[PDB]
Design an enzyme around this catalytic site. Structure first.
Site, PDB file in Angstrom:
ATOM      1  N   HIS A  63       0.971  -1.191   0.066  1.00 19.07           N
ATOM      2  CA  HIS A  63      -0.065   0.141   0.140  1.00 19.07           C
ATOM      3  C   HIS A  63       0.902   1.133  -0.088  1.00 19.07           C
ATOM      4  O   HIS A  63       0.610   2.102  -0.849  1.00 19.07           O
ATOM      5  CB  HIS A  63      -1.075   0.072   1.197  1.00 19.07           C
ATOM      6  CG  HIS A  63      -1.827  -1.090   1.421  1.00 19.07           C
ATOM      7  ND1 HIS A  63      -2.559  -1.574   0.380  1.00 19.07           N
ATOM      8  CD2 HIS A  63      -1.716  -2.183   2.404  1.00 19.07           C
ATOM      9  CE1 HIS A  63      -3.465  -2.716   1.046  1.00 19.07           C
ATOM     10  NE2 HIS A  63      -2.686  -2.988   1.966  1.00 19.07           N
ATOM     11  N   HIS A  93       4.846   6.994   7.224  1.00 14.45           N
ATOM     12  CA  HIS A  93       4.722   6.395   5.956  1.00 14.45           C
ATOM     13  C   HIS A  93       4.346   7.816   5.306  1.00 14.45           C
ATOM     14  O   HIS A  93       3.928   8.630   5.680  1.00 14.45           O
ATOM     15  CB  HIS A  93       3.900   5.361   5.968  1.00 14.45           C
ATOM     16  CG  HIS A  93       2.386   5.659   6.250  1.00 14.45           C
ATOM     17  ND1 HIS A  93       2.119   5.421   7.441  1.00 14.45           N
ATOM     18  CD2 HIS A  93       1.323   6.397   5.571  1.00 14.45           C
ATOM     19  CE1 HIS A  93       0.614   6.056   7.611  1.00 14.45           C
ATOM     20  NE2 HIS A  93       0.412   6.480   6.688  1.00 14.45           N
ATOM     21  N   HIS A  95       1.667   9.068   1.678  1.00 19.13           N
ATOM     22  CA  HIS A  95       0.733   8.992   0.474  1.00 19.13           C
ATOM     23  C   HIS A  95       1.052   9.992  -0.574  1.00 19.13           C
ATOM     24  O   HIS A  95       1.631  11.089  -0.185  1.00 19.13           O
ATOM     25  CB  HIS A  95      -0.774   9.394   0.975  1.00 19.13           C
ATOM     26  CG  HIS A  95      -1.172   8.633   2.216  1.00 19.13           C
ATOM     27  ND1 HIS A  95      -1.752   7.631   2.220  1.00 19.13           N
ATOM     28  CD2 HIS A  95      -0.647   8.672   3.683  1.00 19.13           C
ATOM     29  CE1 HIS A  95      -2.039   7.208   3.340  1.00 19.13           C
ATOM     30  NE2 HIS A  95      -1.342   7.967   4.230  1.00 19.13           N
ATOM     31  N   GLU A 105      -3.608  13.614   1.323  1.00 20.15           N
ATOM     32  CA  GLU A 105      -5.066  13.214   1.870  1.00 20.15           C
ATOM     33  C   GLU A 105      -5.966  14.267   2.294  1.00 20.15           C
ATOM     34  O   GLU A 105      -6.989  14.441   1.679  1.00 20.15           O
ATOM     35  CB  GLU A 105      -4.748  12.052   2.874  1.00 20.15           C
ATOM     36  CG  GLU A 105      -4.244  11.011   2.157  1.00 20.15           C
ATOM     37  CD  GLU A 105      -4.455   9.733   3.026  1.00 20.15           C
ATOM     38  OE1 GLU A 105      -4.259   9.648   4.150  1.00 20.15           O
ATOM     39  OE2 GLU A 105      -4.899   8.582   2.529  1.00 20.15           O
ATOM     40  N   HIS A 118       2.862  10.939   7.099  1.00 19.03           N
ATOM     41  CA  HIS A 118       2.200  10.595   8.557  1.00 19.03           C
ATOM     42  C   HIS A 118       3.228   9.866   9.486  1.00 19.03           C
ATOM     43  O   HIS A 118       3.616   8.951   9.142  1.00 19.03           O
ATOM     44  CB  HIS A 118       1.032   9.730   8.262  1.00 19.03           C
ATOM     45  CG  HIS A 118      -0.153  10.319   7.602  1.00 19.03           C
ATOM     46  ND1 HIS A 118      -1.095   9.756   6.664  1.00 19.03           N
ATOM     47  CD2 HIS A 118      -0.152  11.762   7.431  1.00 19.03           C
ATOM     48  CE1 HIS A 118      -1.944  10.352   6.141  1.00 19.03           C
ATOM     49  NE2 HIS A 118      -1.483  11.813   6.510  1.00 19.03           N
ATOM     50  N   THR A 197      -6.921   6.523   7.812  1.00 17.29           N
ATOM     51  CA  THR A 197      -7.242   6.873   6.533  1.00 17.29           C
ATOM     52  C   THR A 197      -7.249   5.719   5.627  1.00 17.29           C
ATOM     53  O   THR A 197      -7.534   5.744   4.393  1.00 17.29           O
ATOM     54  CB  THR A 197      -6.314   7.896   5.802  1.00 17.29           C
ATOM     55  OG1 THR A 197      -5.227   7.490   5.538  1.00 17.29           O
ATOM     56  CG2 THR A 197      -6.311   9.304   6.658  1.00 17.29           C
ATOM     57  N   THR A 198      -6.682   4.535   5.993  1.00 16.71           N
ATOM     58  CA  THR A 198      -6.591   3.243   5.443  1.00 16.71           C
ATOM     59  C   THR A 198      -7.711   2.462   6.141  1.00 16.71           C
ATOM     60  O   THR A 198      -7.939   2.348   7.649  1.00 16.71           O
ATOM     61  CB  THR A 198      -5.345   2.588   5.181  1.00 16.71           C
ATOM     62  OG1 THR A 198      -5.031   1.926   6.638  1.00 16.71           O
ATOM     63  CG2 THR A 198      -4.305   3.401   4.819  1.00 16.71           C
TER      64      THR A 198
HETATM   65  N1  LMS Z   1      -5.495  -3.588  11.327  1.00 18.92           N
HETATM   66  C1  LMS Z   1      -4.940  -2.319  11.904  1.00 18.92           C
HETATM   67  N2  LMS Z   1      -5.306  -2.050  13.208  1.00 18.92           N
HETATM   68  C2  LMS Z   1      -4.751  -0.961  13.674  1.00 18.92           C
HETATM   69  N3  LMS Z   1      -4.215   0.072  12.975  1.00 18.92           N
HETATM   70  C3  LMS Z   1      -3.963  -0.426  11.826  1.00 18.92           C
HETATM   71  C4  LMS Z   1      -4.146  -1.575  11.079  1.00 18.92           C
HETATM   72  N4  LMS Z   1      -3.622  -1.479   9.746  1.00 18.92           N
HETATM   73  C5  LMS Z   1      -3.079  -0.472   9.567  1.00 18.92           C
HETATM   74  N5  LMS Z   1      -2.988   0.268  10.754  1.00 18.92           N
HETATM   75  C6  LMS Z   1      -2.454   1.647  11.148  1.00 18.92           C
HETATM   76  O1  LMS Z   1      -3.012   2.839  10.318  1.00 18.92           O
HETATM   77  C7  LMS Z   1      -2.231   3.586   9.732  1.00 18.92           C
HETATM   78  C8  LMS Z   1      -2.892   4.094   8.478  1.00 18.92           C
HETATM   79  O2  LMS Z   1      -3.743   5.295   8.767  1.00 18.92           O
HETATM   80  S1  LMS Z   1      -3.215   6.586   8.723  1.00 18.92           S
HETATM   81  N6  LMS Z   1      -2.880   6.890   6.870  1.00 18.92           N
HETATM   82  O3  LMS Z   1      -2.011   6.819   9.287  1.00 18.92           O
HETATM   83  O4  LMS Z   1      -4.163   7.311   9.164  1.00 18.92           O
HETATM   84  C9  LMS Z   1      -1.006   2.803   9.174  1.00 18.92           C
HETATM   85  O5  LMS Z   1      -0.064   3.236   8.775  1.00 18.92           O
HETATM   86  C10 LMS Z   1      -0.899   1.770  10.646  1.00 18.92           C
HETATM   87  O6  LMS Z   1      -0.119   2.540  11.446  1.00 18.92           O
HETATM   88 ZN    ZN Z   2      -1.251   7.428   6.389  1.00 21.08          ZN
END
Ligand code: LMS
Ligand code: ZN
Ligand code: NA
EC number: 4.2.1.1
Length: 259
Positions: A63, A93, A95, A105, A118, A197-198
Protein backbone atom coordinates in the site's frame (compact mmCIF):
# COMPACT_ATOMS: atom_id res chain seq x y z
CA UNK A 1 -8.46 -11.78 4.88
CA UNK A 2 -9.18 -8.35 3.36
CA UNK A 3 -8.05 -7.19 -0.21
CA UNK A 4 -8.23 -3.46 -0.22
CA UNK A 5 -6.18 -1.03 -2.25
CA UNK A 6 -6.40 2.13 -4.32
CA UNK A 7 -7.58 0.82 -7.71
CA UNK A 8 -11.03 1.06 -9.37
CA UNK A 9 -11.93 -2.38 -8.10
CA UNK A 10 -10.65 -2.22 -4.52
CA UNK A 11 -10.24 1.45 -3.77
CA UNK A 12 -11.84 3.94 -1.39
CA UNK A 13 -15.34 3.69 -2.89
CA UNK A 14 -15.37 -0.03 -2.05
CA UNK A 15 -13.95 0.04 1.47
CA UNK A 16 -17.27 0.50 3.25
CA UNK A 17 -18.40 -3.03 2.37
CA UNK A 18 -15.76 -4.74 4.57
CA UNK A 19 -15.33 -1.68 6.83
CA UNK A 20 -18.72 0.02 7.35
CA UNK A 21 -17.12 2.69 9.59
CA UNK A 22 -15.90 4.14 6.27
CA UNK A 23 -19.21 6.06 6.32
CA UNK A 24 -18.84 7.06 10.00
CA UNK A 25 -19.04 10.31 11.85
CA UNK A 26 -15.32 11.12 12.23
CA UNK A 27 -13.62 9.88 9.09
CA UNK A 28 -10.34 11.19 7.67
CA UNK A 29 -8.96 12.88 5.71
CA UNK A 30 -10.90 16.12 5.39
CA UNK A 31 -10.59 19.41 3.52
CA UNK A 32 -9.23 22.11 5.81
CA UNK A 33 -11.11 25.27 5.05
CA UNK A 34 -8.73 27.93 6.32
CA UNK A 35 -11.54 30.50 6.62
CA UNK A 36 -13.67 28.26 8.85
CA UNK A 37 -10.90 26.85 11.09
CA UNK A 38 -10.74 28.84 14.32
CA UNK A 39 -7.68 29.95 16.15
CA UNK A 40 -7.81 28.40 19.60
CA UNK A 41 -5.65 30.50 21.96
CA UNK A 42 -5.94 27.70 24.56
CA UNK A 43 -4.04 25.05 22.59
CA UNK A 44 -0.66 24.38 24.37
CA UNK A 45 2.50 24.57 22.19
CA UNK A 46 3.29 21.29 20.27
CA UNK A 47 6.29 19.33 21.63
CA UNK A 48 8.04 17.03 19.18
CA UNK A 49 10.77 15.13 21.13
CA UNK A 50 12.53 12.91 18.62
CA UNK A 51 16.13 13.06 19.93
CA UNK A 52 16.23 9.42 21.12
CA UNK A 53 14.30 7.96 18.14
CA UNK A 54 15.40 4.44 17.15
CA UNK A 55 14.38 3.47 13.64
CA UNK A 56 14.54 -0.24 12.79
CA UNK A 57 13.32 -1.25 9.42
CA UNK A 58 11.55 -0.14 6.24
CA UNK A 59 8.79 -2.30 4.78
CA UNK A 60 6.77 -2.23 1.52
CA UNK A 61 3.32 -3.36 2.72
CA UNK A 62 1.69 -3.34 -0.71
CA UNK A 63 0.00 0.00 0.00
CA UNK A 64 2.88 2.29 1.04
CA UNK A 65 6.23 1.90 2.79
CA UNK A 66 6.50 2.03 6.54
CA UNK A 67 9.59 3.17 8.48
CA UNK A 68 9.26 1.42 11.81
CA UNK A 69 10.55 2.55 15.20
CA UNK A 70 11.36 0.92 18.51
CA UNK A 71 8.40 1.98 20.66
CA UNK A 72 9.26 -0.31 23.64
CA UNK A 73 10.00 2.87 25.69
CA UNK A 74 9.43 6.70 25.44
CA UNK A 75 12.20 7.32 22.97
CA UNK A 76 10.49 9.57 20.43
CA UNK A 77 7.29 11.23 21.62
CA UNK A 78 4.72 13.82 20.77
CA UNK A 79 3.12 15.90 23.55
CA UNK A 80 1.35 19.23 23.94
CA UNK A 81 -0.86 20.92 21.43
CA UNK A 82 -4.30 19.36 21.72
CA UNK A 83 -2.92 16.21 23.37
CA UNK A 84 -3.34 15.10 26.94
CA UNK A 85 -0.39 12.96 27.98
CA UNK A 86 2.36 11.26 25.95
CA UNK A 87 2.16 9.71 22.50
CA UNK A 88 4.94 7.38 21.33
CA UNK A 89 6.19 7.32 17.74
CA UNK A 90 5.68 3.88 16.15
CA UNK A 91 6.10 4.45 12.43
CA UNK A 92 5.91 6.84 9.55
CA UNK A 93 4.72 6.49 5.99
CA UNK A 94 3.61 8.63 3.07
CA UNK A 95 0.73 9.03 0.59
CA UNK A 96 1.60 10.34 -2.88
CA UNK A 97 0.36 10.84 -6.41
CA UNK A 98 1.06 9.84 -9.98
CA UNK A 99 1.68 13.53 -10.79
CA UNK A 100 2.65 16.51 -8.63
CA UNK A 101 -0.93 17.91 -8.56
CA UNK A 102 -2.30 15.21 -6.36
CA UNK A 103 -1.20 12.81 -3.63
CA UNK A 104 -2.12 14.39 -0.29
CA UNK A 105 -5.02 13.12 1.78
CA UNK A 106 -5.83 16.28 3.62
CA UNK A 107 -6.41 19.31 1.39
CA UNK A 108 -6.15 23.01 2.23
CA UNK A 109 -8.89 25.10 0.70
CA UNK A 110 -9.28 22.15 -1.74
CA UNK A 111 -5.56 22.32 -2.66
CA UNK A 112 -3.91 18.93 -3.09
CA UNK A 113 -0.23 18.63 -2.32
CA UNK A 114 2.13 16.21 -4.09
CA UNK A 115 2.33 13.96 -1.03
CA UNK A 116 1.64 13.74 2.69
CA UNK A 117 3.80 12.31 5.47
CA UNK A 118 2.15 10.66 8.47
CA UNK A 119 4.05 10.16 11.70
CA UNK A 120 1.92 7.75 13.74
CA UNK A 121 1.97 7.86 17.55
CA UNK A 122 0.04 6.01 20.27
CA UNK A 123 -1.18 7.19 23.66
CA UNK A 124 0.98 5.49 26.29
CA UNK A 125 -1.90 5.41 28.82
CA UNK A 126 -3.25 2.44 26.85
CA UNK A 127 -0.07 0.36 27.11
CA UNK A 128 0.26 -0.86 23.50
CA UNK A 129 -0.72 0.21 20.02
CA UNK A 130 -3.40 -2.48 19.58
CA UNK A 131 -5.21 -1.29 22.71
CA UNK A 132 -4.78 2.36 21.78
CA UNK A 133 -6.55 2.02 18.43
CA UNK A 134 -9.70 0.88 20.31
CA UNK A 135 -9.90 4.28 22.03
CA UNK A 136 -11.19 7.61 20.70
CA UNK A 137 -7.97 9.34 21.89
CA UNK A 138 -5.68 6.45 21.17
CA UNK A 139 -3.52 7.83 18.33
CA UNK A 140 -2.01 11.13 17.29
CA UNK A 141 -0.98 11.37 13.63
CA UNK A 142 1.28 14.28 12.70
CA UNK A 143 0.64 15.10 9.05
CA UNK A 144 3.08 17.05 6.91
CA UNK A 145 2.46 18.12 3.34
CA UNK A 146 5.09 17.71 0.62
CA UNK A 147 5.46 20.09 -2.33
CA UNK A 148 7.90 19.73 -5.19
CA UNK A 149 10.74 22.20 -5.25
CA UNK A 150 14.14 21.94 -3.60
CA UNK A 151 15.37 18.60 -2.33
CA UNK A 152 14.81 17.63 1.33
CA UNK A 153 18.20 16.41 2.53
CA UNK A 154 16.70 14.48 5.43
CA UNK A 155 14.56 12.50 3.02
CA UNK A 156 17.34 11.23 0.78
CA UNK A 157 18.23 8.21 2.98
CA UNK A 158 14.66 7.03 2.57
CA UNK A 159 14.72 7.59 -1.19
CA UNK A 160 17.95 5.66 -1.61
CA UNK A 161 16.71 2.51 0.12
CA UNK A 162 13.50 2.24 -1.97
CA UNK A 163 15.26 0.26 -4.71
CA UNK A 164 15.73 -2.55 -2.15
CA UNK A 165 12.02 -2.74 -1.21
CA UNK A 166 10.41 -2.43 -4.64
CA UNK A 167 7.70 -4.99 -4.12
CA UNK A 168 5.11 -5.95 -1.56
CA UNK A 169 6.53 -7.82 1.43
CA UNK A 170 10.10 -6.68 0.98
CA UNK A 171 11.88 -5.03 3.91
CA UNK A 172 15.35 -3.64 4.66
CA UNK A 173 17.31 -2.69 7.76
CA UNK A 174 16.73 1.07 8.37
CA UNK A 175 18.52 1.95 11.55
CA UNK A 176 19.80 5.34 12.64
CA UNK A 177 17.32 7.39 10.63
CA UNK A 178 16.51 10.75 12.25
CA UNK A 179 12.87 11.77 11.66
CA UNK A 180 13.70 15.34 12.74
CA UNK A 181 15.04 15.78 9.22
CA UNK A 182 11.51 15.49 7.82
CA UNK A 183 9.99 18.44 9.68
CA UNK A 184 9.37 21.98 8.35
CA UNK A 185 10.63 25.02 10.32
CA UNK A 186 7.24 25.96 11.77
CA UNK A 187 5.10 23.76 14.03
CA UNK A 188 1.95 25.83 13.34
CA UNK A 189 -0.90 23.34 12.88
CA UNK A 190 -4.54 22.51 12.44
CA UNK A 191 -6.16 19.82 14.55
CA UNK A 192 -9.40 17.83 14.52
CA UNK A 193 -10.70 14.42 15.62
CA UNK A 194 -10.70 11.73 12.95
CA UNK A 195 -9.72 8.31 11.84
CA UNK A 196 -7.16 6.12 10.18
CA UNK A 197 -7.28 6.90 6.47
CA UNK A 198 -6.73 3.25 5.48
CA UNK A 199 -8.72 0.19 6.44
CA UNK A 200 -9.63 -0.55 9.18
CA UNK A 201 -10.58 3.16 9.27
CA UNK A 202 -10.75 3.21 13.08
CA UNK A 203 -12.02 6.42 14.66
CA UNK A 204 -9.12 6.70 17.11
CA UNK A 205 -7.02 9.59 15.82
CA UNK A 206 -6.29 13.13 16.93
CA UNK A 207 -5.02 14.68 13.69
CA UNK A 208 -2.34 17.37 13.86
CA UNK A 209 -1.66 18.73 10.35
CA UNK A 210 1.23 21.15 9.99
CA UNK A 211 0.54 24.31 8.02
CA UNK A 212 4.00 24.56 6.47
CA UNK A 213 4.80 22.01 3.78
CA UNK A 214 8.24 20.57 3.32
CA UNK A 215 9.82 20.82 -0.10
CA UNK A 216 11.15 17.72 -1.82
CA UNK A 217 12.69 17.48 -5.28
CA UNK A 218 11.04 16.11 -8.38
CA UNK A 219 13.73 13.39 -8.39
CA UNK A 220 12.86 12.37 -4.84
CA UNK A 221 9.14 11.99 -5.52
CA UNK A 222 9.82 10.25 -8.83
CA UNK A 223 11.59 7.54 -6.87
CA UNK A 224 8.53 7.05 -4.65
CA UNK A 225 6.60 6.43 -7.85
CA UNK A 226 8.93 3.59 -8.89
CA UNK A 227 7.72 1.42 -6.02
CA UNK A 228 5.29 -1.40 -6.73
CA UNK A 229 1.98 -2.36 -5.10
CA UNK A 230 2.48 -5.91 -6.46
CA UNK A 231 4.67 -8.66 -5.13
CA UNK A 232 7.94 -9.93 -6.69
CA UNK A 233 7.49 -11.59 -10.05
CA UNK A 234 3.94 -10.28 -10.46
CA UNK A 235 3.02 -7.80 -13.21
CA UNK A 236 4.01 -4.28 -12.36
CA UNK A 237 1.46 -1.98 -10.78
CA UNK A 238 3.22 1.23 -9.85
CA UNK A 239 2.66 2.40 -6.29
CA UNK A 240 1.05 5.78 -7.02
CA UNK A 241 -2.14 7.49 -5.93
CA UNK A 242 -2.24 5.72 -2.57
CA UNK A 243 -4.40 8.45 -1.01
CA UNK A 244 -7.99 8.51 0.22
CA UNK A 245 -9.94 11.63 -0.80
CA UNK A 246 -11.52 14.06 1.64
CA UNK A 247 -14.46 12.79 3.67
CA UNK A 248 -17.46 14.60 5.10
CA UNK A 249 -16.60 16.89 8.02
CA UNK A 250 -19.93 16.21 9.74
CA UNK A 251 -20.23 17.74 13.25
CA UNK A 252 -16.51 18.58 13.60
CA UNK A 253 -14.50 21.69 14.19
CA UNK A 254 -10.98 22.21 12.87
CA UNK A 255 -8.91 24.31 15.25
CA UNK A 256 -5.81 26.35 14.33
CA UNK A 257 -2.83 26.84 16.63
CA UNK A 258 -2.00 30.17 14.93
CA UNK A 259 -3.74 33.41 13.99
N1 LMS B 1 -5.35 -3.53 11.34
C1 LMS B 1 -4.90 -2.34 11.86
N2 LMS B 1 -5.22 -2.02 13.09
C2 LMS B 1 -4.78 -0.86 13.57
N3 LMS B 1 -4.04 0.07 12.97
C3 LMS B 1 -3.74 -0.31 11.73
C4 LMS B 1 -4.12 -1.47 11.10
N4 LMS B 1 -3.65 -1.49 9.79
C5 LMS B 1 -3.01 -0.36 9.67
N5 LMS B 1 -3.02 0.39 10.81
C6 LMS B 1 -2.36 1.69 11.01
O1 LMS B 1 -3.08 2.69 10.30
C7 LMS B 1 -2.15 3.50 9.60
C8 LMS B 1 -2.84 4.09 8.39
O2 LMS B 1 -3.71 5.18 8.76
S1 LMS B 1 -3.18 6.67 8.57
N6 LMS B 1 -2.93 6.85 7.04
O3 LMS B 1 -1.95 6.80 9.27
O4 LMS B 1 -4.31 7.39 9.04
C9 LMS B 1 -1.04 2.54 9.26
O5 LMS B 1 0.18 3.21 8.90
C10 LMS B 1 -0.90 1.77 10.55
O6 LMS B 1 -0.11 2.50 11.48
ZN1 ZN C 1 -1.30 7.63 6.33
NA1 NA D 1 9.56 23.69 4.89
Amino acid sequence: SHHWGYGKHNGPEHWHKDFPIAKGERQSPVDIDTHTAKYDPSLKPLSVSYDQATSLRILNNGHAFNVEFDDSQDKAVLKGGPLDGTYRLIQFHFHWGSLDGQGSEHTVDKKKYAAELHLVHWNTKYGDFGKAVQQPDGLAVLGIFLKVGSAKPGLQKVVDVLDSIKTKGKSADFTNFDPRGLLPESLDYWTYPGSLTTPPLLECVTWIVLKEPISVSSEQVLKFRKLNFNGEGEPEELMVDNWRPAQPLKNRQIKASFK
